[PDB]
Amino acid sequence: TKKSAAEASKKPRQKRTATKAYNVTQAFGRRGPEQTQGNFGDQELIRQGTDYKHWPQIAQFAPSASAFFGMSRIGMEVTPSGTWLTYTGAIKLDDKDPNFKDQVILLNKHIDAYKTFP
Amino acid sequence: TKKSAAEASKKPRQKRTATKAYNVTQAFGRRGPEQTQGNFGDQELIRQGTDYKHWPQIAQFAPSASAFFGMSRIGMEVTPSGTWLTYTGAIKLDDKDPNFKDQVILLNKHIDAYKTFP
């Protein structure tokens, strides 16, 4: 029953789950500055994906499918590469959560982390 | 065991699941043009949420938590309303899926649908 990395890659990109065996770079591409690239994750999170120590503390901010379509600004664009469903939005952190300060520190660690990789 | 609408509202906004009993407007606010508002869903999808006939065909495009953090451009902004985790990205439709044409029609039905509500 244990899935191979190849089996994990069969999922459409938006449904993939990164792990140590099939990591963020492998599932989602290198981190970088371009619009088409993801910018989130330090070297530890990139190499570990959902096996990362603080994954549950990151995932608490990810939207359910209902919320993704409920909260976001959704669009459609046709380009040479194909037809794309575009999305933007924002998620409010709970500054009454006693973990607020740690959540900010955690998110900041990963945002644009690639800029200081050795 | 059946959850009340009040119980559904206890979830953080990004984790809510809209249904007929706790619908898109109730969970996620009115549709509209502002940056802070969602723009997706016709009257049927708004009133039904995940009970909508074509929900599975919409949800196939929503990201897993790993993909949401892997694919998107993530940021943090502090405003008067609080601290926000910002996100943008795009999801490619599979133009080899025999359902492609129907997926485009479906998404277009819901994008900015509020503009033609009676």
PDB file of C-alpha atoms in Angstrom:
ATOM      1  CA  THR A   1       0.000   0.000   0.000  1.00  0.00           C
ATOM      2  CA  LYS A   2       2.922   2.484   0.597  1.00  0.00           C
ATOM      3  CA  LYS A   3       2.870   5.031  -2.239  1.00  0.00           C
ATOM      4  CA  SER A   4       5.912   5.675  -4.387  1.00  0.00           C
ATOM      5  CA  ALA A   5       7.114   9.130  -5.283  1.00  0.00           C
ATOM      6  CA  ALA A   6       5.986   8.374  -8.807  1.00  0.00           C
ATOM      7  CA  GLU A   7       2.440   7.677  -7.519  1.00  0.00           C
ATOM      8  CA  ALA A   8       2.536  11.013  -5.596  1.00  0.00           C
ATOM      9  CA  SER A   9       3.516  12.784  -8.855  1.00  0.00           C
ATOM     10  CA  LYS A  10       0.441  11.396 -10.651  1.00  0.00           C
ATOM     11  CA  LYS A  11      -1.760  13.840  -8.687  1.00  0.00           C
ATOM     12  CA  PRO A  12      -2.622  17.096 -10.436  1.00  0.00           C
ATOM     13  CA  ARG A  13      -0.180  19.789  -9.195  1.00  0.00           C
ATOM     14  CA  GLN A  14      -2.791  21.455  -6.930  1.00  0.00           C
ATOM     15  CA  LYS A  15      -3.563  18.126  -5.220  1.00  0.00           C
ATOM     16  CA  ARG A  16       0.027  17.021  -4.544  1.00  0.00           C
ATOM     17  CA  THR A  17       1.333  16.536  -1.028  1.00  0.00           C
ATOM     18  CA  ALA A  18       5.064  17.131  -0.511  1.00  0.00           C
ATOM     19  CA  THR A  19       6.996  14.825   1.812  1.00  0.00           C
ATOM     20  CA  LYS A  20      10.609  13.855   2.335  1.00  0.00           C
ATOM     21  CA  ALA A  21      10.249  11.286  -0.500  1.00  0.00           C
ATOM     22  CA  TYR A  22       8.653  13.779  -2.888  1.00  0.00           C
ATOM     23  CA  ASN A  23       9.622  17.208  -1.686  1.00  0.00           C
ATOM     24  CA  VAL A  24       8.516  20.807  -2.308  1.00  0.00           C
ATOM     25  CA  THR A  25      10.962  21.365  -5.165  1.00  0.00           C
ATOM     26  CA  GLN A  26       9.932  18.064  -6.784  1.00  0.00           C
ATOM     27  CA  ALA A  27       6.153  18.623  -6.433  1.00  0.00           C
ATOM     28  CA  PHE A  28       5.996  22.388  -6.861  1.00  0.00           C
ATOM     29  CA  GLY A  29       9.182  23.633  -8.475  1.00  0.00           C
ATOM     30  CA  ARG A  30      12.098  25.654  -7.197  1.00  0.00           C
ATOM     31  CA  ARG A  31      11.367  28.605  -5.025  1.00  0.00           C
ATOM     32  CA  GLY A  32      11.904  31.947  -6.689  1.00  0.00           C
ATOM     33  CA  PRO A  33      10.900  35.507  -7.517  1.00  0.00           C
ATOM     34  CA  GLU A  34       8.712  34.974 -10.595  1.00  0.00           C
ATOM     35  CA  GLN A  35       4.967  35.211 -10.620  1.00  0.00           C
ATOM     36  CA  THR A  36       4.632  31.603 -11.670  1.00  0.00           C
ATOM     37  CA  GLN A  37       6.899  30.307  -8.871  1.00  0.00           C
ATOM     38  CA  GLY A  38       6.192  29.659  -5.222  1.00  0.00           C
ATOM     39  CA  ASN A  39       8.214  31.709  -2.745  1.00  0.00           C
ATOM     40  CA  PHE A  40       7.480  29.868   0.488  1.00  0.00           C
ATOM     41  CA  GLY A  41       9.714  27.591   2.493  1.00  0.00           C
ATOM     42  CA  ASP A  42      13.174  27.428   4.049  1.00  0.00           C
ATOM     43  CA  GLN A  43      15.531  24.564   3.270  1.00  0.00           C
ATOM     44  CA  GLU A  44      14.073  22.385   6.005  1.00  0.00           C
ATOM     45  CA  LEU A  45      10.458  22.837   4.878  1.00  0.00           C
ATOM     46  CA  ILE A  46      11.443  22.365   1.218  1.00  0.00           C
ATOM     47  CA  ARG A  47      13.215  19.083   1.919  1.00  0.00           C
ATOM     48  CA  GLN A  48      10.575  17.746   4.331  1.00  0.00           C
ATOM     49  CA  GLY A  49       7.206  19.063   3.130  1.00  0.00           C
ATOM     50  CA  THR A  50       4.430  17.790   5.359  1.00  0.00           C
ATOM     51  CA  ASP A  51       7.029  15.852   7.417  1.00  0.00           C
ATOM     52  CA  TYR A  52       8.357  19.246   8.630  1.00  0.00           C
ATOM     53  CA  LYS A  53       8.210  19.668  12.413  1.00  0.00           C
ATOM     54  CA  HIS A  54       5.897  22.707  12.279  1.00  0.00           C
ATOM     55  CA  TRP A  55       3.751  21.577   9.357  1.00  0.00           C
ATOM     56  CA  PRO A  56       0.513  21.490  11.389  1.00  0.00           C
ATOM     57  CA  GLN A  57       1.161  25.113  12.447  1.00  0.00           C
ATOM     58  CA  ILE A  58       1.502  26.153   8.814  1.00  0.00           C
ATOM     59  CA  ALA A  59      -1.402  24.034   7.511  1.00  0.00           C
ATOM     60  CA  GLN A  60      -3.812  25.676   9.998  1.00  0.00           C
ATOM     61  CA  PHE A  61      -3.785  28.674   7.655  1.00  0.00           C
ATOM     62  CA  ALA A  62      -4.429  26.733   4.403  1.00  0.00           C
ATOM     63  CA  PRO A  63      -8.025  26.998   3.127  1.00  0.00           C
ATOM     64  CA  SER A  64     -10.570  24.233   2.837  1.00  0.00           C
ATOM     65  CA  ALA A  65     -11.828  23.828  -0.739  1.00  0.00           C
ATOM     66  CA  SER A  66     -15.012  25.691   0.215  1.00  0.00           C
ATOM     67  CA  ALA A  67     -13.047  28.565   1.718  1.00  0.00           C
ATOM     68  CA  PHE A  68     -10.601  28.714  -1.144  1.00  0.00           C
ATOM     69  CA  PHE A  69     -13.538  29.332  -3.529  1.00  0.00           C
ATOM     70  CA  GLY A  70     -15.471  31.394  -0.948  1.00  0.00           C
ATOM     71  CA  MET A  71     -12.809  33.834   0.197  1.00  0.00           C
ATOM     72  CA  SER A  72     -10.635  34.318  -2.845  1.00  0.00           C
ATOM     73  CA  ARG A  73     -10.722  36.531  -5.876  1.00  0.00           C
ATOM     74  CA  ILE A  74     -10.994  34.012  -8.695  1.00  0.00           C
ATOM     75  CA  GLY A  75     -10.256  34.565 -12.398  1.00  0.00           C
ATOM     76  CA  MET A  76      -9.538  32.777 -15.619  1.00  0.00           C
ATOM     77  CA  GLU A  77      -6.735  33.676 -18.043  1.00  0.00           C
ATOM     78  CA  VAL A  78      -5.821  32.141 -21.391  1.00  0.00           C
ATOM     79  CA  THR A  79      -2.111  32.398 -22.203  1.00  0.00           C
ATOM     80  CA  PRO A  80       0.286  30.519 -24.542  1.00  0.00           C
ATOM     81  CA  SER A  81       1.037  27.986 -21.774  1.00  0.00           C
ATOM     82  CA  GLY A  82      -2.733  27.176 -21.470  1.00  0.00           C
ATOM     83  CA  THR A  83      -5.877  28.083 -19.504  1.00  0.00           C
ATOM     84  CA  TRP A  84      -5.290  29.102 -15.875  1.00  0.00           C
ATOM     85  CA  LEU A  85      -7.549  29.578 -12.873  1.00  0.00           C
ATOM     86  CA  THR A  86      -6.095  32.575 -10.999  1.00  0.00           C
ATOM     87  CA  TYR A  87      -6.557  33.257  -7.298  1.00  0.00           C
ATOM     88  CA  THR A  88      -5.766  35.945  -4.728  1.00  0.00           C
ATOM     89  CA  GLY A  89      -6.795  36.557  -1.178  1.00  0.00           C
ATOM     90  CA  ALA A  90      -5.846  37.072   2.446  1.00  0.00           C
ATOM     91  CA  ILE A  91      -6.269  35.157   5.691  1.00  0.00           C
ATOM     92  CA  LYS A  92      -6.440  36.956   9.020  1.00  0.00           C
ATOM     93  CA  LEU A  93      -4.310  35.669  11.880  1.00  0.00           C
ATOM     94  CA  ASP A  94      -5.965  35.616  15.320  1.00  0.00           C
ATOM     95  CA  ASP A  95      -3.966  38.035  17.469  1.00  0.00           C
ATOM     96  CA  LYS A  96      -5.834  36.593  20.546  1.00  0.00           C
ATOM     97  CA  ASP A  97      -4.351  33.133  19.861  1.00  0.00           C
ATOM     98  CA  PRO A  98      -1.628  32.760  22.512  1.00  0.00           C
ATOM     99  CA  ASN A  99       0.499  31.284  19.668  1.00  0.00           C
ATOM    100  CA  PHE A 100       0.193  34.425  17.529  1.00  0.00           C
ATOM    101  CA  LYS A 101       3.740  35.602  18.034  1.00  0.00           C
ATOM    102  CA  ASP A 102       5.121  32.164  17.173  1.00  0.00           C
ATOM    103  CA  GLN A 103       2.863  31.986  14.070  1.00  0.00           C
ATOM    104  CA  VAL A 104       4.245  35.274  12.772  1.00  0.00           C
ATOM    105  CA  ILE A 105       7.842  34.145  13.434  1.00  0.00           C
ATOM    106  CA  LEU A 106       7.147  30.822  11.669  1.00  0.00           C
ATOM    107  CA  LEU A 107       5.552  32.349   8.582  1.00  0.00           C
ATOM    108  CA  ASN A 108       8.263  34.996   8.303  1.00  0.00           C
ATOM    109  CA  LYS A 109      10.931  32.265   8.470  1.00  0.00           C
ATOM    110  CA  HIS A 110       9.540  30.691   5.297  1.00  0.00           C
ATOM    111  CA  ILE A 111       8.397  33.697   3.277  1.00  0.00           C
ATOM    112  CA  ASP A 112      11.077  34.446   0.646  1.00  0.00           C
ATOM    113  CA  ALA A 113      13.527  32.228   2.546  1.00  0.00           C
ATOM    114  CA  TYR A 114      15.184  31.236  -0.768  1.00  0.00           C
ATOM    115  CA  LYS A 115      16.733  34.713  -0.987  1.00  0.00           C
ATOM    116  CA  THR A 116      19.252  33.809   1.779  1.00  0.00           C
ATOM    117  CA  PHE A 117      20.020  30.206   0.856  1.00  0.00           C
ATOM    118  CA  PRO A 118      23.756  29.500   0.804  1.00  0.00           C
TER     119      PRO A 118
ATOM    120  CA  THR B   1     -23.619  14.142  16.135  1.00  0.00           C
ATOM    121  CA  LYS B   2     -25.193  16.374  13.378  1.00  0.00           C
ATOM    122  CA  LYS B   3     -23.446  19.760  13.495  1.00  0.00           C
ATOM    123  CA  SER B   4     -25.383  22.983  13.871  1.00  0.00           C
ATOM    124  CA  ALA B   5     -24.722  26.045  11.780  1.00  0.00           C
ATOM    125  CA  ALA B   6     -23.357  27.632  14.924  1.00  0.00           C
ATOM    126  CA  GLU B   7     -20.829  24.767  15.268  1.00  0.00           C
ATOM    127  CA  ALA B   8     -19.827  25.275  11.584  1.00  0.00           C
ATOM    128  CA  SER B   9     -19.239  28.992  12.328  1.00  0.00           C
ATOM    129  CA  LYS B  10     -16.802  28.144  15.149  1.00  0.00           C
ATOM    130  CA  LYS B  11     -14.196  27.118  12.535  1.00  0.00           C
ATOM    131  CA  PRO B  12     -11.649  29.763  11.581  1.00  0.00           C
ATOM    132  CA  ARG B  13     -12.841  31.441   8.337  1.00  0.00           C
ATOM    133  CA  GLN B  14     -10.282  29.592   6.156  1.00  0.00           C
ATOM    134  CA  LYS B  15     -11.428  26.211   7.520  1.00  0.00           C
ATOM    135  CA  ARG B  16     -15.190  26.714   7.120  1.00  0.00           C
ATOM    136  CA  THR B  17     -17.258  24.531   4.826  1.00  0.00           C
ATOM    137  CA  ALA B  18     -20.359  26.141   3.299  1.00  0.00           C
ATOM    138  CA  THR B  19     -23.538  24.083   2.975  1.00  0.00           C
ATOM    139  CA  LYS B  20     -27.230  24.778   2.578  1.00  0.00           C
ATOM    140  CA  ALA B  21     -27.477  25.222   6.387  1.00  0.00           C
ATOM    141  CA  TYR B  22     -24.496  27.577   6.554  1.00  0.00           C
ATOM    142  CA  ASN B  23     -24.068  29.034   3.114  1.00  0.00           C
ATOM    143  CA  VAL B  24     -21.384  30.960   1.204  1.00  0.00           C
ATOM    144  CA  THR B  25     -22.694  34.375   2.240  1.00  0.00           C
ATOM    145  CA  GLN B  26     -22.927  33.258   5.884  1.00  0.00           C
ATOM    146  CA  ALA B  27     -19.450  31.643   6.016  1.00  0.00           C
ATOM    147  CA  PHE B  28     -17.560  33.942   3.666  1.00  0.00           C
ATOM    148  CA  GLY B  29     -19.465  37.180   3.226  1.00  0.00           C
ATOM    149  CA  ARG B  30     -21.377  38.672   0.338  1.00  0.00           C
ATOM    150  CA  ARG B  31     -19.873  38.426  -3.074  1.00  0.00           C
ATOM    151  CA  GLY B  32     -18.526  41.677  -4.430  1.00  0.00           C
ATOM    152  CA  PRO B  33     -15.906  43.773  -6.193  1.00  0.00           C
ATOM    153  CA  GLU B  34     -13.606  44.696  -3.295  1.00  0.00           C
ATOM    154  CA  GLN B  35     -10.225  43.187  -2.687  1.00  0.00           C
ATOM    155  CA  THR B  36     -11.316  41.804   0.650  1.00  0.00           C
ATOM    156  CA  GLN B  37     -14.437  40.111  -0.779  1.00  0.00           C
ATOM    157  CA  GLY B  38     -14.846  36.854  -2.639  1.00  0.00           C
ATOM    158  CA  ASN B  39     -16.208  37.116  -6.175  1.00  0.00           C
ATOM    159  CA  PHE B  40     -17.036  33.487  -6.902  1.00  0.00           C
ATOM    160  CA  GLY B  41     -20.402  31.804  -7.093  1.00  0.00           C
ATOM    161  CA  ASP B  42     -23.812  32.142  -8.729  1.00  0.00           C
ATOM    162  CA  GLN B  43     -26.980  32.167  -6.649  1.00  0.00           C
ATOM    163  CA  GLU B  44     -27.225  28.386  -6.653  1.00  0.00           C
ATOM    164  CA  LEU B  45     -23.639  27.834  -5.480  1.00  0.00           C
ATOM    165  CA  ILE B  46     -23.966  30.607  -2.875  1.00  0.00           C
ATOM    166  CA  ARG B  47     -27.108  29.094  -1.378  1.00  0.00           C
ATOM    167  CA  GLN B  48     -25.883  25.482  -1.523  1.00  0.00           C
ATOM    168  CA  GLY B  49     -22.114  25.565  -0.963  1.00  0.00           C
ATOM    169  CA  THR B  50     -20.703  22.057  -1.002  1.00  0.00           C
ATOM    170  CA  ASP B  51     -24.249  20.684  -1.543  1.00  0.00           C
ATOM    171  CA  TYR B  52     -24.153  22.273  -5.039  1.00  0.00           C
ATOM    172  CA  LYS B  53     -24.604  19.755  -7.861  1.00  0.00           C
ATOM    173  CA  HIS B  54     -21.212  20.493  -9.458  1.00  0.00           C
ATOM    174  CA  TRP B  55     -19.245  20.997  -6.249  1.00  0.00           C
ATOM    175  CA  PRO B  56     -16.868  18.075  -6.902  1.00  0.00           C
ATOM    176  CA  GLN B  57     -16.045  19.599 -10.318  1.00  0.00           C
ATOM    177  CA  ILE B  58     -15.146  22.897  -8.673  1.00  0.00           C
ATOM    178  CA  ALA B  59     -13.282  21.375  -5.701  1.00  0.00           C
ATOM    179  CA  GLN B  60     -10.955  19.444  -8.056  1.00  0.00           C
ATOM    180  CA  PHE B  61      -9.177  22.762  -8.608  1.00  0.00           C
ATOM    181  CA  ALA B  62      -8.814  23.721  -4.905  1.00  0.00           C
ATOM    182  CA  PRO B  63      -5.296  23.180  -3.503  1.00  0.00           C
ATOM    183  CA  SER B  64      -4.238  20.743  -0.830  1.00  0.00           C
ATOM    184  CA  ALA B  65      -2.593  22.503   2.126  1.00  0.00           C
ATOM    185  CA  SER B  66       0.819  21.438   0.806  1.00  0.00           C
ATOM    186  CA  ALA B  67       0.070  22.818  -2.646  1.00  0.00           C
ATOM    187  CA  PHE B  68      -1.421  26.012  -1.316  1.00  0.00           C
ATOM    188  CA  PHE B  69       1.902  26.743   0.451  1.00  0.00           C
ATOM    189  CA  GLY B  70       3.980  25.188  -2.363  1.00  0.00           C
ATOM    190  CA  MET B  71       2.502  26.892  -5.407  1.00  0.00           C
ATOM    191  CA  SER B  72       1.433  30.278  -4.137  1.00  0.00           C
ATOM    192  CA  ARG B  73       3.102  33.603  -3.644  1.00  0.00           C
ATOM    193  CA  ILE B  74       2.797  34.102   0.101  1.00  0.00           C
ATOM    194  CA  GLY B  75       3.149  37.359   2.058  1.00  0.00           C
ATOM    195  CA  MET B  76       2.383  38.981   5.354  1.00  0.00           C
ATOM    196  CA  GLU B  77       0.823  42.434   5.784  1.00  0.00           C
ATOM    197  CA  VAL B  78       0.025  44.372   8.947  1.00  0.00           C
ATOM    198  CA  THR B  79      -2.939  46.731   8.561  1.00  0.00           C
ATOM    199  CA  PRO B  80      -5.389  48.421  10.987  1.00  0.00           C
ATOM    200  CA  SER B  81      -7.727  45.400  10.764  1.00  0.00           C
ATOM    201  CA  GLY B  82      -4.854  43.071  11.898  1.00  0.00           C
ATOM    202  CA  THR B  83      -2.105  40.783  10.565  1.00  0.00           C
ATOM    203  CA  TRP B  84      -2.903  39.026   7.274  1.00  0.00           C
ATOM    204  CA  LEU B  85      -1.327  36.158   5.368  1.00  0.00           C
ATOM    205  CA  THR B  86      -1.651  37.116   1.682  1.00  0.00           C
ATOM    206  CA  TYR B  87      -1.695  34.659  -1.206  1.00  0.00           C
ATOM    207  CA  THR B  88      -1.719  34.660  -5.009  1.00  0.00           C
ATOM    208  CA  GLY B  89      -1.269  32.022  -7.629  1.00  0.00           C
ATOM    209  CA  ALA B  90      -2.604  30.153 -10.633  1.00  0.00           C
ATOM    210  CA  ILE B  91      -3.740  26.613 -11.379  1.00  0.00           C
ATOM    211  CA  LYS B  92      -3.470  25.162 -14.868  1.00  0.00           C
ATOM    212  CA  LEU B  93      -6.480  23.369 -16.316  1.00  0.00           C
ATOM    213  CA  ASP B  94      -5.755  20.167 -18.264  1.00  0.00           C
ATOM    214  CA  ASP B  95      -6.867  20.854 -21.837  1.00  0.00           C
ATOM    215  CA  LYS B  96      -6.496  17.053 -22.512  1.00  0.00           C
ATOM    216  CA  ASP B  97      -9.184  16.297 -19.895  1.00  0.00           C
ATOM    217  CA  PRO B  98     -12.265  15.417 -21.972  1.00  0.00           C
ATOM    218  CA  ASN B  99     -14.200  17.567 -19.437  1.00  0.00           C
ATOM    219  CA  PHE B 100     -12.110  20.672 -20.159  1.00  0.00           C
ATOM    220  CA  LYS B 101     -14.789  22.528 -22.054  1.00  0.00           C
ATOM    221  CA  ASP B 102     -17.342  21.864 -19.314  1.00  0.00           C
ATOM    222  CA  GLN B 103     -14.819  22.970 -16.635  1.00  0.00           C
ATOM    223  CA  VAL B 104     -14.308  26.305 -18.372  1.00  0.00           C
ATOM    224  CA  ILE B 105     -18.085  26.808 -18.748  1.00  0.00           C
ATOM    225  CA  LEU B 106     -18.591  25.930 -15.058  1.00  0.00           C
ATOM    226  CA  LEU B 107     -15.896  28.252 -13.734  1.00  0.00           C
ATOM    227  CA  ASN B 108     -17.036  31.101 -15.974  1.00  0.00           C
ATOM    228  CA  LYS B 109     -20.609  30.666 -14.690  1.00  0.00           C
ATOM    229  CA  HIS B 110     -19.447  31.438 -11.150  1.00  0.00           C
ATOM    230  CA  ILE B 111     -16.709  34.014 -11.687  1.00  0.00           C
ATOM    231  CA  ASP B 112     -18.185  37.478 -10.986  1.00  0.00           C
ATOM    232  CA  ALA B 113     -21.692  35.997 -11.192  1.00  0.00           C
ATOM    233  CA  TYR B 114     -22.906  38.537  -8.587  1.00  0.00           C
ATOM    234  CA  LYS B 115     -22.677  41.285 -11.220  1.00  0.00           C
ATOM    235  CA  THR B 116     -25.838  39.941 -12.956  1.00  0.00           C
ATOM    236  CA  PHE B 117     -27.916  38.960  -9.933  1.00  0.00           C
ATOM    237  CA  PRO B 118     -31.481  40.262 -10.154  1.00  0.00           C
TER     238      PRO B 118
END
